[PDB]
């Protein structure tokens, strides 16, 4: 019943789909503003 997790993991090992925004979102002109999902910290920007 949990075949979906294994299948998604195997697919992502080679190619991980981009998680597109869903629902209402903020717009700046013709652009959707979303916070970066990168776990890594931008040390240069922070300090």
């Amino acid at each position: 019943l949990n075949r979906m997790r294994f299948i998604t993991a195997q697919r992502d090992r080679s190619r991980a789909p981009w998680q597109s925004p869903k629902g209402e979102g903020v717009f700046q002109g013709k652009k959707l503003i979303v916070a970066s999902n990168s776990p890594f910290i931008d040390d240069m920007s922070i300090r």
């Binding site: 240069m44 920007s45 922070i46 300090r47």
Partner: protein
Amino acid sequence: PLAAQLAINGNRNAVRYENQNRTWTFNELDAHTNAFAYGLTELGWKAGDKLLLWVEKNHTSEITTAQVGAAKAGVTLVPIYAHSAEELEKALNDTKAKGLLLSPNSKAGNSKYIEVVNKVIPELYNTGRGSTLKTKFANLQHIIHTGFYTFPGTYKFRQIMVYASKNFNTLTLPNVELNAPLFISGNQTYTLKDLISKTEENRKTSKLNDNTPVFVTGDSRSPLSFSLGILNSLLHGNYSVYTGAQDLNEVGQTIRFYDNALLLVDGDIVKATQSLKHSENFAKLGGVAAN
């Protein structure tokens, strides 16, 4: 005036930056400061032009290099302590500064220095690449940030720096004038001669001999810090060590190696630190002075 140490012994260490872990000899310090002065001259800075300093404590090397280069080029520096866009704009309007050097990542209130600058001057966002600034102030020609990233309407400190060639240098450095203003602190203006007099008076009061290494904690933009730091080293050949934002604990660890060594203690640093973890590190401080 600023080359006596080079003439005597240029190999001796000139200044240490413990926070960023870089030590400069007299030759290296002179080279960097001359590069900064040449960069300003090429950009078009003249005698009497005003540059605003908005760089936090951590950028001790940048502060010292800018100060010495401004002294060499006859450019007056105005430190500004503004935590709000209102204060920044008021200072800019009051001073009519030709340049503004700042630290972008520094946080003022709920916004960073770069964000506040952009808010005060929205024209920077849409300014063309390689285009002069057309701002409300009509005189803030140059904006410089000491940061890794680049922003429109701004230039990096290294990009501003210009290392003159030995046989391909068409620039000229005006002779340093002692009476020319160098620092504008508050409503009082300090000239190079007055700063030298302050250094001599402080040395006499504190029994600061030639071989006593001076330590400076906190911002190096203060006139007293400039007098007892890089200026003292360049005049009497002493050894200055800048700790920047380091607290009394970390200052102490560096201090232990140094012997009979003067310490300059920032009020801001004192309040931030809770207590001394190892008071033994200060057992041989020799002398202590307060801004």
